[PDB]
Amino acid sequence: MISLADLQRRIETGELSPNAAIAQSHAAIEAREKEVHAFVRHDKSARAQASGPLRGIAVGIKDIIDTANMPTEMGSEIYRGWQPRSDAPVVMMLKRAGATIIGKTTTTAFASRDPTATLNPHNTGHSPGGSSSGSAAAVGAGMIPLALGTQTGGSVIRPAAYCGTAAIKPSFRMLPTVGVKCYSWALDTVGLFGARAEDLARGLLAMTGRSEFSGIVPAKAPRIGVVRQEFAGAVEPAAEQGLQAAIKAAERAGASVQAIDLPEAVHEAWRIHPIIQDFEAHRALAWEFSEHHDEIAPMLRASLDATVGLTPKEYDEARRIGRRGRRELGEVFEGVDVLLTYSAPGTAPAKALASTGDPRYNRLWTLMGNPCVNVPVLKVGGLPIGVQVIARFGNDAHALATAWFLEDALAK
Amino acid sequence: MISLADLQRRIETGELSPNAAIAQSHAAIEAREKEVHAFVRHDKSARAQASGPLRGIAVGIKDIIDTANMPTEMGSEIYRGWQPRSDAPVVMMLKRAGATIIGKTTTTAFASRDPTATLNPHNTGHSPGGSSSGSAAAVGAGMIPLALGTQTGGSVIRPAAYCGTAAIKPSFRMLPTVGVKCYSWALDTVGLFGARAEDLARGLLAMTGRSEFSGIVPAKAPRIGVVRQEFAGAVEPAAEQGLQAAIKAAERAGASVQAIDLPEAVHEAWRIHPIIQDFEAHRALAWEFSEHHDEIAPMLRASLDATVGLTPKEYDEARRIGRRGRRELGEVFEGVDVLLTYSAPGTAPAKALASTGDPRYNRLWTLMGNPCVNVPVLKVGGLPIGVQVIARFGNDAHALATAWFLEDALAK
Numbered sequence: 001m002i003s004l005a006d007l008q009r010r011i012e013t014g015e016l017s018p019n020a021a022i023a024q025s026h027a028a029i030e031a032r033e034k035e036v037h038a039f040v041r042h043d044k045s046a047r048a049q050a051s052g053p054l055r056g057i058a059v060g061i062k063d064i065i066d067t068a069n070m071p072t073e074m075g076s077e078i079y080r081g082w083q084p085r086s087d088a089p090v091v092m093m094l095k096r097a098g099a100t101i102i103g104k105t106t107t108t109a110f111a112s113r114d115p116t117a118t119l120n121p122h123n124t125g126h127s128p129g130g131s132s133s134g135s136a137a138a139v140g141a142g143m144i145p146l147a148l149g150t151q152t153g154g155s156v157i158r159p160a161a162y163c164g165t166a167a168i169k170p171s172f173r174m175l176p177t178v179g180v181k182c183y184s185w186a187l188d189t190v191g192l193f194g195a196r197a198e199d200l201a202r203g204l205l206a207m208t209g210r211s212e213f214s215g216i217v218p219a220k221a222p223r224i225g226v227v228r229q230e231f232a233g234a235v236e237p238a239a240e241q242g243l244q245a246a247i248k249a250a251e252r253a254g255a256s257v258q259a260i261d262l263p264e265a266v267h268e269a270w271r272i273h274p275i276i277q278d279f280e281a282h283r284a285l286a287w288e289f290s291e292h293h294d295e296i297a298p299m300l301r302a303s304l305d306a307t308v309g310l311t312p313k314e315y316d317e318a319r320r321i322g323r324r325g326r327r328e329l330g331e332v333f334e335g336v337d338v339l340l341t342y343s344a345p346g347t348a349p350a351k352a353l354a355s356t357g358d359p360r361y362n363r364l365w366t367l368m369g370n371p372c373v374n375v376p377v378l379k380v381g382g383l384p385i386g387v388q389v390i391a392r393f394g395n396d397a398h399a400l401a402t403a404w405f406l407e408d409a410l411a412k
Numbered sequence: 413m414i415s416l417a418d419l420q421r422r423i424e425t426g427e428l429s430p431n432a433a434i435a436q437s438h439a440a441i442e443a444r445e446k447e448v449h450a451f452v453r454h455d456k457s458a459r460a461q462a463s464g465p466l467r468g469i470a471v472g473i474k475d476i477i478d479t480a481n482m483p484t485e486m487g488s489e490i491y492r493g494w495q496p497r498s499d500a501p502v503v504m505m506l507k508r509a510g511a512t513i514i515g516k517t518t519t520t521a522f523a524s525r526d527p528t529a530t531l532n533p534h535n536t537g538h539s540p541g542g543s544s545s546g547s548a549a550a551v552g553a554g555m556i557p558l559a560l561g562t563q564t565g566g567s568v569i570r571p572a573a574y575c576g577t578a579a580i581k582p583s584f585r586m587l588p589t590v591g592v593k594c595y596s597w598a599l600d601t602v603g604l605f606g607a608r609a610e611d612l613a614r615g616l617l618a619m620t621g622r623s624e625f626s627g628i629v630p631a632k633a634p635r636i637g638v639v640r641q642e643f644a645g646a647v648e649p650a651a652e653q654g655l656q657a658a659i660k661a662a663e664r665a666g667a668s669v670q671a672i673d674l675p676e677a678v679h680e681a682w683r684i685h686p687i688i689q690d691f692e693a694h695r696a697l698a699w700e701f702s703e704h705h706d707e708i709a710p711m712l713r714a715s716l717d718a719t720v721g722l723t724p725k726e727y728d729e730a731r732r733i734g735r736r737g738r739r740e741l742g743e744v745f746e747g748v749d750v751l752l753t754y755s756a757p758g759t760a761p762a763k764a765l766a767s768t769g770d771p772r773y774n775r776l777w778t779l780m781g782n783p784c785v786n787v788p789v790l791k792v793g794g795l796p797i798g799v800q801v802i803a804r805f806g807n808d809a810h811a812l813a814t815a816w817f818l819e820d821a822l823a824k
Contacts, residue, residue, distance in 0.1 A: 068699065085494050092698035176695050178594045185588060210724045284590050286504035287480065312622045 001165060002028070002145040004057060004199035011056045018048035018056030022100050025058035028143045029102070035124060037117045038138035041070060042103040052098020053206040059094055060105040060138045060147040064181035065190075067091055067101060074181050075107040075116065075131075078288060078295050088179025090148060090190050090207070097206040105134025105147060108356060110285060111155060111183050112300035115354055121163055123382055126348040129159030130356025132191070136163040139193040140384075146203055147193040152183045152277060154344075154362020156191030157388055160374040161343035162357065164384030166403070167193045168200045170396050172369030175207070184280040186319070187273075187366050197373060197403040204396070212397040219398070219405040222255045225336035231267040232360040236346025242377040242385035243342060246406060250340075253409035257340075262332065269325025270364040272318035278307040279315040322367050329368055330392070338402045339390040343374050347383035361388070371396035373403040377410060413577060414440065416469055416557040416611040423468045430460035430468030434512050437470035441514070441555045447536060449529045450549035453482055454515040464510020465618040471506055472517040472550045472559035477602075478591035479503060479513060486593050487519040487528060487543075490704050500591025502560060502602055502619070509618035517546025517559060520768060522697060523567060523595050526709035527766055533575055535794055538760040541571030542768025544603070548575040551605040552796075558615050559605040564595050564689060566756075566774020568603030569800055572786040573755035574769065576796030578815070579605045580612045583806050584781030587619070596692040598731070599685075599778050609785060609815040616808070624809040631810070631817040633666040637748035640671075643679040644772040648758025654789040654797035655754060658818060662752075665821035672748065674741075681737025682776040687730035689775075690719040734779050738805075741780055745804040750814045752799060755786045759795035773800075783808035785815040789822060 002025070010016040029042055040063050048056045066072050066084035073079045091101060106116040111131040118133040120126040121141035128137035132149030139147050140163030149156050151169045160167030168191060175190040182188055194200045198216070205213035226247060228235070247257050282289065282304065288296060289304055296304070332339070342361045349355045365372050365388075373389045389406060391399035414437070422428040441454055452475045461467045478484050478496035485491040503513060518528045523543035530545040532538040533553035540549035544561025551559050552575030561568050563581045572579030580603060587602040594600055606612045610628070617625035638659060640647075659669050693716065694701065700708060701716055708716070744751070754773045761767045777784050777800075785801040801818065803811035 068703075079497060082497055085491065086699035086703075089695045089698050092702065093695070096698065096702065173597070176594075176597060176692075178597065178696050182588075182590045185585075185590060208724060280588075283501045283505070283588055286501050286508065287498040290504060290508065291480075312620060 001139060001142045001195040003195045004145040005202050007057060007145055008053065008202060016056070021056035022046065022048040022058055025102055025144050032141050032143060036119055036121055036137050036141045038105055038134040038141060038143065040073060040104045040106050040134070043070060043101070046100050046102045048100055049098040052096070054094060055098035057099050057146060058102040058144045059099050060103055060135055060144045061091060061101060062132050062135050062149045063104040063107045064111055064150065065091060065148060066179035067104065070104055072104065074110055076109040076297065078292050084179070086179065089176040091179070093207040102144060105138055107131055108133060109297035109300055110181065111150060111152065112297065112303070113356055114297035114299045115356055119351065120348050122384055126350050126383060127162065127356055129162035129348060131155035132159050133356065135193050136160050136165060139163065139165045139195070145194060145199065149191045149193060150180060151189050151191050151362070151366050152187040153366060154359030157362045157372055157374050158344045158357050158359055160193055161386035162348035162384060164376045164379070164386070165193050166196045166200060166376065167191060167374045168396070168400065169366065169372040170204070171371045171394050174396065182284045184277045184284065186276050186280055189366060196407060197400045200373070201400045216397060216401055218408055219401040220254070222402045222405055223335065223337040224250060224255050224257045225332065225339045226257060226259045227262055227339050227341045229270070229341055229361055229364065231270055235342055238346040238380040238385050239342045239344065241380065243340070243387055246340065246375070246377050246387045246410065249409040250406060253405065255405070258336070260332065263328040265324045265328040266364070268321050269367055272321050273363045273367045275310065275314060275318035276322065276367065278303065279310040282308060282310070326368055333392045337391070338399060341388050341390065343386040343388040347380055347385060365390055369393050371399040373399045375403050375406045413551060413554045413607040414557040415607040417614045419468060419557055420465065420614060428468065430462065433468030434458065434460040434470055437514055437556050444533070444553045444555055448531050448533055448549050448553050450517055450546040450553065450555065452485065452516045452518050452546065455482060455513070458512050458514045460512050461510040464508070466506065467510035469511045469558060470514040470556045471511050472515055472547055472556050473503060473513055474544050474547050474561045475516040475519045476523050476562060476593035477503060477560060479516065482516055484516065486522055488521040488709065490700060490707050496591065498591065501588040502592070505619040514556060517550055519543055520545060521709035521712055522593065523562060523564065524709065524712035525715065525768060526711045527768055531763065532760050534796055538762055538795060539574065539768055541574035541760060543567035544571050545768070547605050548572050548577060551575070551577045551607070557606060557611065561603045561605060562592060563601045563603050563774070563778050564599040565778060566771030569774050569784055569786045570756045570769050570771055572605060573798035574760035574796060576788040576791070576798065577605050578608045578612055578788065579603060579786045580808070580812065581778065581784045582616065582808050583783045586808065594696045596689045596696065598688050598692060601778060608819060609812045612785070613812045628809055628813055630820055631813040633668065634814045634817060635749040636662060636667055636669045637672040637744070637751045638669060639674055639751050639753045641674070641753055641773055641776065643682050647754050647773065650792040650797050651754050651756065651758040653792065655799055658752065658787070658789050658799045658822065661821040661824070662818055665817065667817070667821070672744065674744070677740040678737045678776070680733050681779055684730035684733045685775040685779050687722065687726060688734065688779065690715070691722045691727040694720065694722070738780055742804065749803070750811060751802040753802065755798040755800040759792050759797060777802060781805050783811040785811050787815050787818045
């Protein structure tokens with residue numbers, strides 16, 4: 001994989017030129033696209049910008065995020081050829097920083113469960129996860145140093161884990177969702193994919209200009225709280241192996257680790273996530289559901305059809321339950337700096353299963369809003385397994401700091 | 413003005429056909445549009461639907477809200493001829509209920525300060541207010557029974573007051589802002605314009621399907637708390653005259669009225685509203701500011717140029733102040749059912765002043781999130797003056813109930 005931070009340093013010290021860096025991504029993409037299929041469209045004419053911390057940095061954009069110079073097809077035929085008038089605010093944050101929008105990465109139809117043609121870089125016979133399939137695969141394939149995606153359930157953390165890349169789902173609403181195809185406004189959150197935690201930090205620094213993302217360094221002797229989200233059902237062996245490896249490395253590295261059970265209120269929040277997501281989806285995708293019902297991908301159309309009956313009453317109750325969950329989750333962070341848990345059920349499912357994986361270990365955190373970071377741990381049968389580092393709401397900088405510490409710890 | 417609730421009843425009993433109702437609206441728009449200029453686009457072919465609670469109900473849509481069959485130009489040359497692919501969720505809520513989207517109403521460029529060509533129905537020499545100019549003017553001129561607008565500062569309540577129409581800015585996020593041109597995601601709120609409070613209730617009921625809007629009836633002897641928002645300075649004579657008239661009518665109607673002071677925390681919330689609005693504006697309008705700077709309307713362009721320096725730091729601090737205000741405000745709604753204040757600085761400004769009016773008496777409430785309702789009280793020099801009814805967050809129904817009460821009390 002390509003490191004954003006590495007590219008920056010080399011460009012800053014005249015070692016590498018912005019153009020060369022971009023040309024390299026162009027090459028990397030063409031070298032493996034026929035095998036990975038991570039891009040809906042590759043803008044081969046894309047050139048590096050003159051200035052900015054992100055000059056020479058090629059970025060892939062999930063195809064539900066608006067771009068003015070390239071179509072935004074939402075992974076659906078309904079939007080074939082669709083061309084937004086303006087660039088989404090998040091795309092502009094990148095451009096203003098000197099980044100190069102190299103292309104649009106594949107997304108499941110409307111960011112749902114319907115598989116794309118994209119394949120896992122580690123094993124062509126496996127899924128790269130979803131819904132941010134192309135962003136994760138492209139970064140995992142070493143095509144680009146950065147990519148944007150989104151998470152409502154777990155479309156940032158899950159595919160990152162599956163493809164073995166670093167990634168972060170910042171605190172809810174930190175990054176604007178304007179110009180981002182909505183599924184559930186109460187959940188939709190923009191995320192970033194990169195090689196390591198440090199790359200994510202530099203990416204967020206350039207995008208937001210927030211000092212907290214500047215000068216970040218690996219955390220020392222972090223206080224980790226391990227949660228296995230039992231309420232989410234049984235996990236696959238490979239996932240537990242990864243978690244245990246992480247815990248062990250962390251301990252050897254000097255961290256303090258303790259197992260803790262989440263409050264019953266938090267469990268409840270996890271349970272009603274589907275209610276909030278599905279109710280709002282009917283509102284957010286009202287036009288598509290009413291005017292182009294039969295054109296909606298199979299799986300998405302099935303979930304919508306099965307949820308037309310959700311009532312405003314139960315919806316409101318679900319949100320109330322979510323709030324309680326957030327309130328009680330905060331107390332948990334009085335003893336620990338971050339929470340460590342699974343990033344996915346296990347290794348990436350085989351493409352033959354026609355599944356982008358289950359977000360049951362991700363969804364709770366999207367609703368809580370806390371910043372989440374994926375840390376690649378190991379590989380089983382050649383397929384990546386990662387862990388999820390979660391910090392207090394708004395403490396994105398610390399989450400990255402701890403993920404960094406964890407990366408170094410695993411490196412022994 | 414055309415009453416939505418009135419049409420519903422007559423249509424329901426078979427006294428009025430939906431087709432006739434819609435024909436009525438077209439004729440009404442035709443008779444006053446050439447002088448008011450409230451519509452950016454009037455769809456003369458718009459027909460009535462056969463079923464649903466809003467069948468036969470014509471609705472005007474502010475032109476920052478997406479429509480799939482009509483252009484959405486944001487009141488700016490930058491979006492001349494721009495055609496969204498889909499109808500915004502709020503528009504779909506109306507259509508699914510059987511409503512007829514009769515056209516797009518004028519909006520200031522990107523919902524800011526730059527005046528539109530729309531004129532006040534009560535006096536063409538005055539402003540209809542902004543930024544929801546067309547929606548307020550159209551309803552105020554008796555053209556349509558319902559219209560959608562938006563409020564970030566006071567673009568719902570203020571123009572409603574200026575045009576003498578009933579209107580409501582629902583609780584924050586109760587109505588989706590998807591497909592609604594964003595200015596400030598922390599403030600942007602969809603609102604409705606109608607003849608009377610009852611009309612607003614019926615509209616929300618059909619749109620949301622929430623039982624809280626069903627069976628709404630005038631309130632009895634409500635506990636009103638009068639607040640003059642001193643932090644915003646003194647209002648114009650006409651405005652005070654209207655408030656005094658409202659208080660007197662309410663008292664003689666059996667209501668308990670008492671003057672109340674707003675906690676310092678709330679005052680501060682009002683003060684930092686500009687910080688939040690302007691900071692986000694730069695992110696939300698990044699493409700426009702960076703790629704079409706000189707094409708942006710004069711006033712909005714100047715305010716943007718003057719705020720480029722706002723830091724994320726002062727922004728975060730501003731939000732913290734806002735949250736603090738929200739908590740203490742709730743405490744206020746413990747001894748009183750609703751608050752009563754000004755809807756605007758006074759009568760509608762003369763067009764010559766090139767001003768849509770000062771929203772200093774509206775902005776606080778948009779940030780607090782509380783449901784606000786404008787109640788027409790009287791006229792000065794032929795220009796309408798209204799008052800603003802405010803209830804606790806999520807108590808929209810009660811707000812409407814009390815507003816209805818005030819309407820009846822004013823009629824004596």
